[PDB]
Every structure is written in structure tokens, then in C-alpha cells.
Amino acid sequence: FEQVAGSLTPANLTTAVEQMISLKYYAGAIQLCLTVAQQKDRGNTALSWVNDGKPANDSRKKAFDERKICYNLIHQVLDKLESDFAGEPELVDGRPTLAATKRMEAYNVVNDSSDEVFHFDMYEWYIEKGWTDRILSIDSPHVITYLQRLAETDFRHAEL
Amino acid sequence: SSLDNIEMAYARQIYIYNEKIVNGHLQPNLVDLCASVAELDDKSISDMWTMVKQMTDVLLTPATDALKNRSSVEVRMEFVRQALAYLEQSYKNYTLVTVFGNLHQAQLGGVPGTYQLVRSFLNIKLPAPLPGLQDGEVEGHPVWALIYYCMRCGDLLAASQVVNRAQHQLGEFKTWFQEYMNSKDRRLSPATENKLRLHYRRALRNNTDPYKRAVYCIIGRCDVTDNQSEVADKTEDYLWLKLNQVCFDPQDRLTLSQFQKQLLEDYGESHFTVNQQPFLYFQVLFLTAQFEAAVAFLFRMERLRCHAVHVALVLFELKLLLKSSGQSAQLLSHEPGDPPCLRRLNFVRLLMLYTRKFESTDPREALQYFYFLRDEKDSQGENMFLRCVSELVIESREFDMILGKLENDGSRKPGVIDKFTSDTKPIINKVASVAENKGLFEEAAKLYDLAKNADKVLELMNKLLSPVVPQISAPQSNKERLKNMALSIAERYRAQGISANKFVDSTFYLLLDLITFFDEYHSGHIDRAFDIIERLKLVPLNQESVEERVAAFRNFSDEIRHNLSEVLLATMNILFTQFKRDRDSQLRSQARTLITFAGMIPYRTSGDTNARLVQMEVLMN
Numbered sequence: 001f002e003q004v005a006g007s008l009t010p011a012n013l014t015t016a017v018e019q020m021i022s023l024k025y026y027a028g029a030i031q032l033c034l035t036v037a038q039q040k041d042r043g044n045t046a047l048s049w050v051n052d053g054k055p056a057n058d059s060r061k062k063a064f065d066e067r068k069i070c071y072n073l074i075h076q077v078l079d080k081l082e083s084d085f086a087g088e089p090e091l092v093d094g095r096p097t098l099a100a101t102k103r104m105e106a107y108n109v110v111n112d113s114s115d116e117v118f119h120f121d122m123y124e125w126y127i128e129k130g131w132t133d134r135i136l137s138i139d140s141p142h143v144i145t146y147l148q149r150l151a152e153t154d155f156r157h158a159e160l
Numbered sequence: 161s162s163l164d165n166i167e168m169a170y171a172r173q174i175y176i177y178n179e180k181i182v183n184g185h186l187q188p189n190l191v192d193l194c195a196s197v198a199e200l201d202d203k204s205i206s207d208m209w210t211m212v213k214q215m216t217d218v219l220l221t222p223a224t225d226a227l228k229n230r231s232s233v234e235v236r237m238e239f240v241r242q243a244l245a246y247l248e249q250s251y252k253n254y255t256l257v258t259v260f261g262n263l264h265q266a267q268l269g270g271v272p273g274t275y276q277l278v279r280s281f282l283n284i285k286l287p288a289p290l291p292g293l294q295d296g297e298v299e300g301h302p303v304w305a306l307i308y309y310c311m312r313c314g315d316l317l318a319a320s321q322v323v324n325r326a327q328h329q330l331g332e333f334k335t336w337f338q339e340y341m342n343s344k345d346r347r348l349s350p351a352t353e354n355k356l357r358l359h360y361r362r363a364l365r366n367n368t369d370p371y372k373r374a375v376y377c378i379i380g381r382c383d384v385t386d387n388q389s390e391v392a393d394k395t396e397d398y399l400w401l402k403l404n405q406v407c408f409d410p411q412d413r414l415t416l417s418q419f420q421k422q423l424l425e426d427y428g429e430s431h432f433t434v435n436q437q438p439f440l441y442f443q444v445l446f447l448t449a450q451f452e453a454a455v456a457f458l459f460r461m462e463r464l465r466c467h468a469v470h471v472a473l474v475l476f477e478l479k480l481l482l483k484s485s486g487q488s489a490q491l492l493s494h495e496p497g498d499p500p501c502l503r504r505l506n507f508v509r510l511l512m513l514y515t516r517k518f519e520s521t522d523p524r525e526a527l528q529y530f531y532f533l534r535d536e537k538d539s540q541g542e543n544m545f546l547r548c549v550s551e552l553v554i555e556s557r558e559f560d561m562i563l564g565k566l567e568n569d570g571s572r573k574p575g576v577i578d579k580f581t582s583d584t585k586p587i588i589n590k591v592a593s594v595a596e597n598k599g600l601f602e603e604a605a606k607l608y609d610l611a612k613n614a615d616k617v618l619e620l621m622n623k624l625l626s627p628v629v630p631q632i633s634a635p636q637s638n639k640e641r642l643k644n645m646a647l648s649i650a651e652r653y654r655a656q657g658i659s660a661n662k663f664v665d666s667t668f669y670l671l672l673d674l675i676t677f678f679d680e681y682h683s684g685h686i687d688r689a690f691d692i693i694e695r696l697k698l699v700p701l702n703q704e705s706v707e708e709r710v711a712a713f714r715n716f717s718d719e720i721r722h723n724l725s726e727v728l729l730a731t732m733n734i735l736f737t738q739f740k741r742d743r744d745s746q747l748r749s750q751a752r753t754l755i756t757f758a759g760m761i762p763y764r765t766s767g768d769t770n771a772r773l774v775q776m777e778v779l780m781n
Contacts, residue, residue: 015582016582016583018582019581019582019583019584020581020582020583021182021184021581022182022578022579022580022581022582023531023534023543023545023546023577023580023581023582023583024181024531024532024534024535024545024580024581025534025543025545025581026534026535027535076184077184079184079185079186080181080182080183080184080185081181081187082181082186082187083180083181083183083184083185083186083187083188084177084178084179084180084181084182084184084185084187085177085180085181085187085188085190085477086177086180086181086185086186086187086188086189086190086193087173087177087187087188087189087190087191087192087193087194088177088187088188088189088190088191088193088473088474088476088477088478089190089191089194089212089216089470089471089472089473089474089475089476089477089478089480090216090220090226090474090475090476090477090478090479090480090481091216091451091471091472091474091475091476091478091480091481092451092455092468092469092470092471092472092473092474092475092476092481093451093452093453093454093455093456093457093458093459093468093471093472093475093481093505094445094446094450094451094452094453094454094455094456094472094475094481094482094503094505095451095452095455095472095475095476095481095482095483095484095503095504095505095507096226096475096476096478096479096480096481096482096483096505096507097472097473097474097475097476097477097478097481097507097532098473098476098477098507098511098531098532098533098534098535098536099177099190099473099476099477099532100226100475100476100477100478100479100480100481101226101476101479101481101483101507101532101535101536102477102532102534102535103222103223103477103478103479104223104224104225104226104479105535106223106535107222107223107224108223108225110223111223131222133222134221134222134223137221
């Protein structure tokens with residue numbers, strides 16, 4: 001799939017991710033989505049379109065939309081992950097379970113990315129789901145700088 | 161079924177937890193899903209999960225590595241507090257059942273205040289006054305006994321109330337205790353902590369009031385070697401006594417690393433399992449953050465395998481279990497490049513053992529446990545969950561149930577694995593691949609056909625047909641049972657417009673025509689059978705076609721050249737019969753053609769065949 005990432009259609013990507021999610025292949029699913037996002041836009045037309053305020057009537061929107069379809073599918077993966085392992089312990093008899101390792105392996109792939117539009121989309125997503133747990137614990141300024149632009153705009157963001 | 165009542169109930173709970181993650185839902189609390197079955201068993205197991213929940217209910221850093229959370233002094237500190245809160249509450253329940261005969265009995269009358277409970281606890285456990293007590297009594301009980309068992313139950317407030325009614329007797333202990341209750345982490349300031357320790361060490365190192373001794377070095381975390389055996393006679397009283405004495409950054413000091421290592425290294429299982437009570441040791445390891453040790457240990461008790469696997473899963477779905485990178489290691493080990501005080505669990509092996517028991521006749525449940533291995537691979541790159549499904553299908557031979565039965569009408573009823581991944585093309589080939597390597601062609605075809613891999617289906621179907629081409633098709637024979645499946649594959653491959661490369665495909669439909677040629681030949685329908693062979697343009701009948709037909713034989717599949725001998729003879733015997741019934745010249749000419757073709761073709765049994773062909777042509781004339 002990764003070899004033909006740039007050519008994958010939203011219908012084929014969705015079905016693939018769903019099938020991988022059903023087989024507990026969370027990390028893998030996420031890695032495909034990121035790869036597809038980066039291949040449908042190697043010039044980062046999306047990053048500049050967001051850095052320019054998203055001017056309507058511009059034709060980078062398409063490039064941004066094709067990445068947003070990948071990012072949404074990543075949300076579903078992480079969602080289904082916490083769902084599948086709801087009630088499962090992170091440790092058994094001392095060492096980590098298999099359900100725990102898949103959580104770490106998945107979230108690794110996430111924090112191991114250099115896609116910037118992606119990390120913006122994830123900050124917004126964490127805020128949405130209410131995970132002040134993880135967002136306030138990033139450390140990075142990148143998230144501060146991102147908030148500094150969106151603060152005078154929304155109460156919830158300003159509070160963060 | 162190989163699953164006991166308890167194990168079965170757990171399987172159902174693990175199916176839910178999987179159904180939730182397979183449909184993307186909320187990640188439910190696994191620890192809660194496991195304690196749901198525990199209540200169906202004796203309280204020996206319920207009180208375990210209670211400890212598991214409270215020991216794992218620590219604020220974590222989601223999406224963080226397992227080793228990092230367990231090495232951080234931040235998390236290691238909260239473990240001690242969660243355990244102390246369990247030992248205190250656990251002891252508080254012991255104090256209730258000691259005063260009231262049943263927890264229900266205590267509840268109906270109302271749980272009394274921790275102070276009045278403790279007082280009603282001292283009445284029983286010391287009916288007569290011990291002559292070595294000090295500092296008088298308070299409302300009919302020694303002041304130090306009340307303070308200890310109140311702190312033991314975890315109600316510092318109840319203990320401080322006792323102090324307030326003995327201000328004159330206790331001396332300066334009031335200002336010290338009031339600081340302990342205020343300061344967090346159950347520690348005093350170094351200055352005041354120094355003032356009391358030196359006082360105790362000065363002239364109270366050996367006091368006739370054991371309760372006084374206990375409280376002082378529980379508040380000052382001193383005299384770590386003295387186990388205060390006068391008051392802490394139970395094992396939980398020891399754990400609780402020490403976890404209130406551990407310290408964090410040289411003399412008369414103990415740390416969690418020393419204590420946790422000191423316990424199992426010097427006083428291993430042998431010391432804590434002489435009373436043949438397994439949970440006692442488990443609680444010692446689990447309430448000291450040594451989760452891998454406790455898991456492996458409890459996993460060896462053949463009666464408690466179920467429980468130890470799940471407490472491992474909980475630690476695994478919480479990024480708290482320390483998995484062993486290498487799969488060739490033992491169940492319990494310490495990585496060479498890690499500190500000696502932590503241990504690692506070979507989680508892959510752990511599940512592999514548990515599964516082998518009920519994987520033979522309970523496949524569905526096995527898969528639910530194999531899923532947790534989805535995030536891991538092996539040295540060869542295969543996905544551990546996928547490989548476990550391959551091995552489980554090769555052994556169990558449960559194809560319709562696990563892989564989905566592809567009926568002969570063109571339907572694919574999904575299997576149990578379809579729930580976990582939608583990309584089922586590789587394993588169906590993996591399972592089909594081995595069964596192909598074991599000469600089980602008739603199965604490898606059904607399996608390859610299940611994955612719509614016509615390149616392999618038709619290949620194998622060519623091998624199964626060639627031997628049976630000239631044979632007699634009789635009811636229930638191996639010809640009917642193979643021809644009828646080949647035709648059920650011809651329709652479904654035409655109605656769906658599927659085909660392999662023309663080499664494999666051409667041969668497959670060619671054999672099907674020949675199988676019809678002999679089925680008509682063996683039935684006596686000579687005219688009808690002659691017409692079929694004529695269409696195929698395989699055997700020349702007019703001298704002009706000999707050159708081209710001979711060249712074609714060179715590049716036709718050997719599954720066809722094999723049966724050339726029987727084709728020539730049947731065709732000859734066909735002309736042979738029609739002769740005994742101008743036309744005579746035409747048959748005579750065709751008879752000749754077959755001979756010259758066979759003469760120029762090197763093939764199977766060309767000796768006996770070429771001779772018989774010539775004899776049958778002579779009788780015609």
C-alpha cells in the first residue's frame with residue numbers, strides 16, 4: 001500500500017484501514033495514513049495554506065482535504081484502540097500486556113511524525129476529545145506557538 | 161471444551177473488549193472487565209483484582225513507553241501510596257470482620273467511626289492490660305495502641321483526635337505528629353525529623369511499650385531493620401510497616417529498590433509459600449511494583465493460570481508491563497542493558513502457553529487472546545497475530561469456521577478472523593501454501609479459490625485432472641468428485657470473468673473438454689465424442705494440418721502431452737468403430753493422419769500406442 005500511497009483513493013484507503021483495525025494492526029494503519037498524506041502533497045501546499053489563514057477560493061484546499069481524510073482515519077484508529085482495550089490492564093503479573101504494547105506502538109508512530117499539518121490537526125483533536133491530560137504534557141513550544149495564534153479567537157484555546 | 165467455568169467467563173469478557181476495539185468504540189476498563197468474573201468466585205480472587213485496580217490506578221503519560229513510566233521516580237512514588245492505601249483499607253476490613261461477624265452485619269448497624277471501631281477492636285485483641293504500656297490510657301485504652309491501629313487503618317484524623325485528648329501526657333509528640341499529618345508523602349521536615357529520631361534513639365530505642373516504638377519510627381521512618389514484630393505479626397502489617405519506611409535520596413535508610421530486591425532475592429518464594437498459600441507471595445510482589453515477578457510466579461500455579469494471564473493483559477493494555485524484546489528468552493529475565501532491580505516478562509511466550517491448552521477445540525476464544533499480539537512481529541517479519549492464525553488453522557483444520565466458507569455458488573460467508581482484519585489475502589495463501597506443500601491439492605485448491613487466486617487454483621486443478629482424464633467417470637468416483645468441482649470452478653470463473661495466465665488457463669479449459677471427450681467415448685456416444693475432439697484441433701485429421709498441429713504439441717502443457725496416448729487411441733477406436741458400421745475413403749484418410757502425427761510426436765507409451773494405431777488402420781482396409 002505504501003508503494004502506491006500517492007495513488008490511493010479515499011474508498012480504498014478507508015476499507016484498508018478498517019480491515020487493519022479489525023485485525024489489531026493499529027500502528028500499521030496509522031503509518032499508512034500518514035504516508036498517504038505526505039505523498040498526495042510533497043510540496044506541503046497544505047502547510048502554507050494553513051499558515052496563510054486558509055484563503056477561500058485558493059486551490060491548495062484540495063491538497064489540505066486529501067490530508068484531512070487521512071487524519072480523520074487516524075482518529076478512528078486511536079478511537080477504536082481505546083475502545084477495543086476498555087477495561088484492559090496496562091500491566092499483568094508485572095510486565096506489560098499485549099494490549100498495552102499496541103497502545104505504545106501506535107502512539108509511538110504518532111509522536112514519531114514530522115508532518116506539521118498533522119500535529120496541528122492532532123492538537124485540535126486532543127482539545128476536542130478533552131484530553132488536557134496529554135496536550136498540557138507535550139512540553140514543546142510548537143504547541144504554544146500554535147495556541148498563540150488561535151488564542152484571540154476561542155475561549156477554550158485561550159484557556160489552554 | 162477445554163475451558164473451565166472461570167476461564168470461559170473470562171473469554172467472554174475478552175470478546176467484549178475485542179468487540180469494542182474491533183468496532184472502534186471506547187477503550188473500556190479491562191481491569192473492570194476482569195473483576196466482573198472474579199465476583200463469581202471466592203473472595204480470594206476478588207481481593208486480588210481490587211489490588212490490581214488500585215495498584216494500576218495511577219496517573220500515567222498516555223502514548224509513553226512502558227520502560228519510561230516504570231523507571232520514573234514520579235510513578236514509582238505513587239505506587240507506594242496506592243499500596244499503602246490498599247494495606248490500610250484491607251486492614252480496616254479485617255478490623256470490621258473482627259468486631260462484627262460479617263461485613264453485612266457491620267453495615268446494617270452502620271460502620272462506626274474509625275475511632276470507635278478501633279476502640280471496639282482493642283477490646284477484643286487485648287482484653288487485659290499489658291503491664292509494659294506507657295503514657296496512660298484514653299477512654300479506657302492505651303493511647304499508643306489507638307494511635308497505631310488508627311494509622312494502620314489509614315485514618316490519620318482519627319489518630320490525631322486521640323492525641324488531642326492526651327496533650328499533657330504525650331509531651332512534644334503533638335507538634336511533631338501534627339506536622340506529619342500536614343506534610344504530604346507521609347514525611348516530616350529534615351529538621352523536625354532529626355529532632356524526633358535522635359530523641360527516640362537517645363533513650364527510647366528499647367521501650368516497654370511496643371506501640372510507642374512502632375508509631376515513632378513509622379513517623380520518622382527509622383529503625384528499618386527492626387520489623388516491630390511485637391505489633392506487625394502479619395505479612396500485610398510488615399509490608400505496610402516498611403512502605404511507610406522507604407525513602408528517596410546513607411545509614412538507617414531503605415529505598416524501594418533495596419526493599420523490593422531485598423525481599424525476593426533473600427526471602428524468595430520459598431519463604432512466602434511454605435504455608436502453601438500462593439496469593440500471599442503475589443501480594444508481596446504486586447504491592448512492591450514487581451509486577452513481572454508476580455505475574456510469572458502466579459502464572460506457574462496451574463490453578464491460577466487464568467488469573468495471572470489477565471493481570472498481565474491489564475498491565476499490557478496500560479503500558480505498564482515490561483515486555484522482553486527477544487522471543488528466545490525465558491519467561492522471566494533481566495535484560496543485560498537494564499538495571500538489575502527490574503525484571504522483564506516474555507509476554508509472547510506467556511500467551512502462547514495459555515493458548516495451546518484451549519486452541520485445539522475452542523478456536524474462537526483463542527483468536528481473542530491472539531489479538532493482543534497484533535502489535536508484535538518476529539525475526540522473520542510476519543505479524544504475530546497473523547502467524548498465530550496460520551498455525552491455528554494448519555493444526556485445527558477449521559477452515560469454514562475461521563476463514564469463511566466459500567460455497568460453490570459464488571458466496572464468501574466471512575469467518576471469525578474477518579472481524580479483526582479485512583486483509584485476509586496473505587494468511588489464506590499461507591494456509592493454502594503449506595497444504596499445497598503437503599500434497600493436499602484438493603484442499604489447497606479450495607483454499608486458494610477462497611482467496612480468488614486463480615493462478616494457483618487452476619494450476620493445482622490441472623494436476624488433479626490430468627491423471628483422471630481418460631479414466632471412467634462413475635458415481636462417487638474420484639473423477640466425478642474432481643470434475644464436478646472443476647466445473648463449479650469453470651462457471652464461477654466465467655460468470656465472474658476470472659482467469660489465470662493463458663498458459664494455466666488454456667490447459668484448464670482444454671482438460672475439461674477432454675474429460676467430456678472421454679465421458680462421451682466411454683458412454684458409446686461415438687458421433688458426439690468425435691465432434692468434440694474435432695473442435696479442439698488437437699489431433700490432426702487432414703494431412704494438411706499435420707505440420708501445424710505437430711508444432712503446437714511442443715509448447716502444450718505436459719499435463720496434456722501425458723494424455724496424448726489415450727486420446728489418439730480413443731480417436732482411432734472411434735474411427736475404428738464407425739468404419740464397421742466416399743465415407744470409407746474419408747475414415748481411411750483420417751486414420752492415416754493420426755498415424756503420421758503420432759509418428760512425428762515423441763510421447764508417453766509411443767511404442768505400444770503407435771503399434772496399435774497401425775493395426776487398427778490395417779483392419780479398416
